[PDB]
Structure formats: C-alpha cells, structure tokens
Amino acid sequence: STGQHPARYPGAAAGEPTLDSWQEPPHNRWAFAHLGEMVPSAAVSRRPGHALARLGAIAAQLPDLEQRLEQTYTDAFLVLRGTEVVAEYYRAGFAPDDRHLLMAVSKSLCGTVVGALVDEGRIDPAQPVTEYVPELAGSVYDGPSVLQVLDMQISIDYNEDYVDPASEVQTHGRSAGWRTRRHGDPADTYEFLTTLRGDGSTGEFQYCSANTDVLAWIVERVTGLRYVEALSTYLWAKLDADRDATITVDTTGFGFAHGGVSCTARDLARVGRMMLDGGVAPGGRVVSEDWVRRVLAGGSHEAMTDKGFTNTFPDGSYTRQWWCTGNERGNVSGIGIHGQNLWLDPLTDSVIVKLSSWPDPYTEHWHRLQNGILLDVSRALDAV
Amino acid sequence: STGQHPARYPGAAAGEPTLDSWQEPPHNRWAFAHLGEMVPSAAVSRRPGHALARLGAIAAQLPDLEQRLEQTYTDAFLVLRGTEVVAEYYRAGFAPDDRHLLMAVSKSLCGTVVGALVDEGRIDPAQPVTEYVPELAGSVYDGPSVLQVLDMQISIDYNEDYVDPASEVQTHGRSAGWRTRRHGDPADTYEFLTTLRGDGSTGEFQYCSANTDVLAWIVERVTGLRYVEALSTYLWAKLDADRDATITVDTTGFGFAHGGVSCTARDLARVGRMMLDGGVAPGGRVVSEDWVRRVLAGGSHEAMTDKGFTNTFPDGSYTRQWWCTGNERGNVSGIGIHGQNLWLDPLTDSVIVKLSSWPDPYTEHWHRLQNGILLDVSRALDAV
Ligand SMILES: NCCCCCC(=O)NCCCCCC(=O)O
Ligand SMILES: NCCCCCC(=O)NCCCCCC(=O)O
C-alpha cells in the first residue's frame, strides 16, 4: 500500500474516477469540467507558418544566432533582461503563446514548491523521507534525508537511460501513463517508487528522476493538496502568468513532477525572474532569500562526479533540483532532455529560456551546442 | 483497412505517434507542443467556492429559478438575448470561463461543419456515404445517403443504452479511448464504425452516436483535415470565441465528434448566435441561410417515432444533427446526456445554454425538468 493520497476531487474515493467510472455520479460533476485529466484531448483553435525572429540587440554580437537555434532544433527561445523581453524566437508552426513540454526543467519547479514548504517549516530537509512518507520504508528512500533527495545524492538501482527500451526510465513512464502499460507493471507512480532499491550509500550525485516524484509525494503528504494544485498554489498562481501551465497525470491524478510540465516560454521566464528577485514574484513571495541564495551557491562539488557535466563545467555541482555550472558567471540552470533550459545569468540580471526538440534525449553533441549558445548569449548581455 | 486518414502532423506515418513513440524523432517536435493529445493532463492554474447567480431580468418572472437549476445539477447556465448576456449562473467550483463537456451537443457542431462543406459543394447529402468513405462498404453505412446519416434515419444494430455495460455505447467508448480497452476491441473509432450492421431499412429515426462519427470521417476525406482542425477552421475559429474548445481524441488523433467537445457556456452561445444570424459569425459565414432555414424547419415528423421525445413534443422531429421540438415557439436544440442543451428561441432572438451533470445520462424525470426550465425561460423572454 502507498497510503493516503489527495482525492481527485472533494470526497472522492481512493483512485476515483477511473477511465471506466468518470461518467458515473458523483465523479461526473468533476470529470465533465476536467475531461482532459482523464482522456487525451486536442485543442480546437479559436484563431483562424513561418519562424518569428526578433533577436534584435544580441544580433549584432551573434549574427548567426538564428541558424544556431535552428541547428539545435529550437522551438521557442526568449531572453528576459531585468523585466524586459529583449530577444525572442519561435520556429515556424509554434506560436509565441503555445506551450512546450519542459521535461526535467519540471524538477526545478518541484524543488521550488519544496522550498516554499521549507520556509513555512512544514518540511525539514534534515529529516528522513520516511518522516513524511512512511510507506517508502523498505525502499531505497528508507534512510536518506529529504535534502539528499533534493540534491540527487542517493545511490539507486535505476538506469536513467532515455533510449534503452528496457531501462527503469521506461518502467517509470509505463507506471505513470507516458508509455503503454504492461501486465505486472506498477499501477501508478507511487507504487513504482516503492519498488526502487539501492546499495544504501549516499553522498555522491546520481541523477534519478524518481527523486523528484518522491519530493512531490512529500509535498502532497505535508499539504494535503494534489501536487497539481500545490504547484499552482505555491508557484504558478503567484507568477502573474499569461497562461495556465499543464502537467501530465497518472491514473490516480498524480502529476508527473519530474518531467511532465508544459508552459509558454515567456511564462517559464517568470520563474527565472522570481529566482533573480530573491524569491519574490508579483503575487507574493514564493521562496525565501536564503533558499535562492543556496541554489545560486551550488551543491558539494565533490559529490558531482558526472564526467560529462564536469568536462564542460569543472567546478559544477547540483542542488535543490538545479544544475550549477560553477563557472565564472555563476550560471545555474534547470535542464531537460531534448534541449530544455531555464538558464539564469545573475551577472546581467537575465533569464534565458530555450525550449527545443533535439532528435536525441541527450548526447555530448547537443550538450556542447546548447551550452555554447546559452553562454554566448549570456556574454552578449554584458556591459561593454 | 479503413483507408487514408489525416496525419497527426505533416509527414506523419499512419497512426503515428503512439504512446510509445511520441518522444522519438520526427514525432517529438509535434508531441512536445501537444502532449495533452497523447497523455491525460491537468491544468496548473495561473489564478490564486460559491455559486454565481446573475439571473437578473428573468428572476422576477421565475423567482425560484436558481433552485430549479440546482435541482437539475446545473454547472453553467447562460441566456443570450440578441447580442447581450441577460442572465448567468455558475455553480460553486465552476468558473464562468471554465470549459464543460458538451456530450451530444457536439453532434450539432459536427453537423454545422458538414453544412459548411455542403455550401462549398464538397459534400452532396444525396450521395451515398460510400461516395466519400468507400471503406464503409459492407457495413450498415453501405447504401444510406449522407443526409440519412445527418438525420439519423438508418436502422442500426447499436443499442444506444448509456448505462448498460454491455451495450455498443461502451464498445464505442473503448474503441475511442473514453473507456479502458479490452483485447479484441477495434483499434480506433474508424475500425469500430466498420463493424456496425443493420437490417438495411432506412427512413425511421434511430438515434445513433456512430452516425456523427461517420460524418466526421466524411469531413476528413473531403477536406484532408483532421476533424479537430476542420472543426476549428469551419466553425470555432469564426466565432470570435474567448477560449479554444477541446475535443477528446482516439489513438489515431481522431476527434470524438459525437460527444467529446468541451467549451465555455458563453462560447457555446456564440454557436447559437450564429444560427439565429442566418449562419453568419463574426469571422465570416459559417453555413448558408438555407442550411439554417432547413434546421429550423425540422425533419420529417413521421420519421420521429421516439415516444419519449414526442410525448413532450408531439410535432417534434430531427434534422442535420439538431432536435426540433415543433412547438409553438419553433424551439430547436442541441442536446447531450446529463443535461447539456444549446437551445434556440428564435421568437425572442435568444440562445439558452445549459450545461449540467445529472447523476443519470437520460431519464424521463430529468428530461421533463430540463425542458420545463428551458421553456419557462424562453417564455420569460417574451415581450409583455
Ligand atoms: N521520465 C521521462 C522524462 C524524464 C526527463 C529527464 C530529463 O529531462 N533529464 C535531464 C538530464 C539533463 C542532464 C544534463 C547534463 O548531464 O549535462
Ligand atoms: N458515447 C458516449 C457519449 C455519447 C453522448 C450521447 C448523448 O449525449 N446523447 C443525447 C441524447 C438526447 C436524447 C433526447 C431525447 O430523447 O429527448
């Protein structure tokens, strides 16, 4: 058993509604107003073909920027300097206000929600995961602290290989609804998490998407809110965003916290703006100054043994669901496969959003090109 | 085989992407911008509890109206007199701009798209279905004309019982993704349609949801557009709507034309406004004056042998995906189970939208109450 979870609607029984019950009472009052949560659905446009390129200022310093964006399969690109949008690009077929999957940039949003609850004293990072989710007893999350989850410093038997059909990535996806279920698969994301094991060691960085979903589970146990609602209440609804975000949900309504958020490029930039404003957003404080300071400060460098990341960023690290370059600019970024970044450049008070669709989830090739663009654009923003 | 269908995106292979392939190239460029079409998804609200009742004018004539709306599980209710919203109600927990499932009011929208294509001379109602969809040869739709589909005048072995777990309604839903698939079920909506049989007789009204999905299939074959896009291009994008509508899609991306559209009450009223304006909408003409005239005129009364409908509306009929009361007011309505109506009152140049969630799909009890409210509100709009 995975214990108590937030009901899909007020008074809902556990796991209700399902695909076979949503038309029946009492479920249908909720379901008829939220059917996209149950059944795949398409937008029918209220609006009756070419790329939009408004790179403007940085164009003089980076003449070939649009070509470099094309070469990295860029769908949306936006630079926010202070409060001003100073450069934008959207590929043909993608509108400025269209939403785009964030992949693991979603993790940085989840970490922010956790941070807000730490500020409220509802989560203590020093406490074991099992203090908040007892049902993870007997799993790899039995022993580690919430901070070690936040920092991805738990050794786990989870092969985070995005291409291997047999990897835990795919099983994770089948459990949550991103992929077709097999018989014998865990019923939902919570159950999948309880199946994970490890050798018990901690302290070394191991990127594992399951960690973020454990954080979201903790958020639910501490607030009593569905993660989807907690993500709105503690973050999204304070941004003065143009559009709702969306997040995929599994068959219990649990949001795919580690990778399933979609939003517009401009709205994602509002998250970066909040970070560079010390944790304050138009709708109120999201996280404490201290939390933001710790994100910008980085994690333990010695924990970061990922050769690929450190080849590019020798003094890099990871903390609280953010990647920290440790470079001379102090760049920090949310990062997702296929080329998603929420990139912070504190030196110039700027945020860079790049949302892409590389053919491959992650390779040194795309990694080098992507980071080259983000660094060049950052430097182009420097006072001269 | 069900023949050629509009690709989910430009250049897509048949049936691509699937739940297991959408992350791979070339699918992922499209899928990352449209993930809700593949995986159930929840809105993360950008906005930070009680019913809104602004019944206003008609309140004096119908003092107990709000109670009557509550008693019929009303979620949204809106009266448009001319171009003016003169009464509104939304239950606690449902916002004025929230979308609501239309159930078979969706059919009236599909019929409108067909009507537009008839105006363009791309569909001839007198022609057999097989003129446009040859693959329906050998099925119950082999022989009948497109008009007989529009008018629901084909005898079909399809038990339209919304509660019986064993009825064709459920198989239809399993084929399309509204319900959990069983082994042996048709793979998609098109395949399900090809399995339908009948005794070959025509001319008598038989309400069958499959008919509308055949119409949507015809729309796709004649335009080359996904039904979702055709619904936008020929109708929704001409309404000057506040929000996109949505429609559920099956595993090929085919919209659930007969029941799967959701939209706001105010936007649905724009469809009624278009009908009462002779087929013209803010964005241009949607259908011809003649088409609208034929809808308002009704179908053959003798074909209408449904005792339930005619008990309430003795001179009632059905044509072109609209129910026609044949009453002294000439009321016509789109109708969906659990209490959805797009109700036209030409006498007062008014449209009534009622979107509800009755516990039961359809019973004489709810039918009597629902129609009593719509008729009383219509009469309350009369000049005195
Ligand atoms: N479970 C399916 C979706 C999971 C998303 C994974 C993801 O986006 N991972 C990001 C990896 C970034 C690696 C950065 C680096 O090594 O330099
Ligand atoms: N296939 C699942 C959804 C199908 C929707 C069916 C629906 O909305 N039907 C409307 C029936 C109206 C009957 C009106 C009357 O008999 O008076």
Swiss-Prot record, chains A, B:
Keyword Hydrolase annotated: yes
EC nos: 3.5.1.46
EC class (word): hydrolase
Substitution effect: H258N: Enhances activity
Pathway of action: Xenobiotic degradation; nylon-6 oligomer degradation
Pfam families: Beta-lactamase
Active site: A104
Keywords attached to this entry: Hydrolase, Nylon degradation, Plasmid
Catalytic activity: [N-(6-aminohexanoyl)](n) + H2O = [N-(6-aminohexanoyl)](n-1) + 6-aminohexanoate; N-(6-aminohexanoyl)-6-aminohexanoate + H2O = 2 6-aminohexanoate
GO biological process: nylon catabolic process
GO molecular function, one term: 6-aminohexanoate-dimer hydrolase activity
Record SUPFAM superfamilies: beta-lactamase/transpeptidase-like
Impact after mutating G173D: Enhances activity
PANTHER family hit by this protein: BETA-LACTAMASE-RELATED, BETA-LACTAMASE-RELATED DOMAIN-CONTAINING PROTEIN
General remark: The EII enzyme is 100 times more active toward the substrate than the EII' enzyme.
Function, in words: Involved in nylon oligomer degradation.
Name listed for the protein in its UniProt record: 6-aminohexanoate-dimer hydrolase
Organism from which the protein derives: Paenarthrobacter ureafaciens
Lineage: Bacteria, Bacillati, Actinomycetota, Actinomycetes, Micrococcales
